[PDB]
Amino acid sequence: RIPVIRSPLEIRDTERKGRGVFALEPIPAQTCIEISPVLMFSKEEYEQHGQYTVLNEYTYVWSEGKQGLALGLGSMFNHDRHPNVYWKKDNRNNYISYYTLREIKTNEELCISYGDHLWFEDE
Amino acid sequence: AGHMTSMRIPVIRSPLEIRDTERKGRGVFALEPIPAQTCIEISPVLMFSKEEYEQHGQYTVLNEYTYVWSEGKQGLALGLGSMFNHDRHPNVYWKKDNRNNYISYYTLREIKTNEELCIS
Ligand SMILES: [N+]
Ligand SMILES: [N+]
Numbered sequence: 001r002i003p004v005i006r007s008p009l010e011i012r013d014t015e016r017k018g019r020g021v022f023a024l025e026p027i028p029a030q031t032c033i034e035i036s037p038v039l040m041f042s043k044e045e046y047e048q049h050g051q052y053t054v055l056n057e058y059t060y061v062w063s064e065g066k067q068g069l070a071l072g073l074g075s076m077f078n079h080d081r082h083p084n085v086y087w088k089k090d091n092r093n094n095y096i097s098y099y100t101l102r103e104i105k106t107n108e109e110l111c112i113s114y115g116d117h118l119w120f121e122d123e
Numbered sequence: 124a125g126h127m128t129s130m131r132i133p134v135i136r137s138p139l140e141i142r143d144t145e146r147k148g149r150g151v152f153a154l155e156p157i158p159a160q161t162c163i164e165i166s167p168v169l170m171f172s173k174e175e176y177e178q179h180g181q182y183t184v185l186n187e188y189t190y191v192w193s194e195g196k197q198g199l200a201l202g203l204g205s206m207f208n209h210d211r212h213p214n215v216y217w218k219k220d221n222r223n224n225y226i227s228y229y230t231l232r233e234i235k236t237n238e239e240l241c242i243s
């Protein structure tokens with residue numbers, strides 16, 4: 001249900017800024033760069049406990065107020081005002097797919113929006 | 124002396140696939156043979172402090188996936204690290220990088236097309 005993607009990404013990991021996902025080489029617009037399996041938290045367990053951990057930096061809203069943590073690279077993308085990556089949530093398959101929003105140049109950081117949303121590509 | 128640290132870690136693109144399994148939920152499977160001692164995955168570790176784990180994290184599904192780390196901390200392997208099933212007869216070993224908060228996973232032997240990769 002989820003194979004290797006094989007995209008020209010690296011993680012950069014600095015004392016200063018922590019971790020981020022960066023382009024090794026130019027990437028075409030609308031290229032799927034990552035498919036991340038999700039670790040799912042129930043609504044109750046995230047409200048009672050999960051939200052008071054560092055999970056609160058990274059998780060995404062899911063259906064019925066459940067909360068998902070993207071494994072793979074998905075939690076590593078930083079947020080920016082001008083993101084170059086967008087994503088789609090798949091409810092049936094419990095993953096999140098990441099796509100380039102435009103052509104990406106070599107050495108650019110791959111960033112997502114600050115904002116979340118709740119709809120699913122399989123709905 | 125010195126300066127701040129700065130690392131560039133590639134994303135190892137191994138011939139692996141996640142599949143749902145019969146009993147064990149998701150697991151990791153080989154798509155083609157893999158030599159012995161090939162590094163198949165380098166997972167960044169999301170670190171939980173002793174306190175947030177003891178007070179909150181252990182009460183969540185995190186408890187099913189995290190690795191005991193030093194000083195009462197618990198590490199959740201991002202990447203594919205949390206997707207390996209555990210096994211009696213594992214064909215994968217791992218090691219922690221305590222300096223940088225990664226876990227690396229290596230095949231214990233030749234892996235065959237369709238075999239499940241399992242740790243302990
Ligand atoms: N899957
Ligand atoms: N609260």
Ligand SMILES: [N+]
Binds near residue numbers: 057059060
């Ligand atoms: N996010």
Ligand SMILES: [N+]
């Ligand atoms: N789009």
Ligand SMILES: [N+]
Binds near residue numbers: 113115116117
């Ligand atoms: N967004």
Ligand SMILES: [N+]
Binds near residue numbers: 182
């Ligand atoms: N609890």
Ligand SMILES: [N+]
Binds near residue numbers: 218243
């Ligand atoms: N191990």
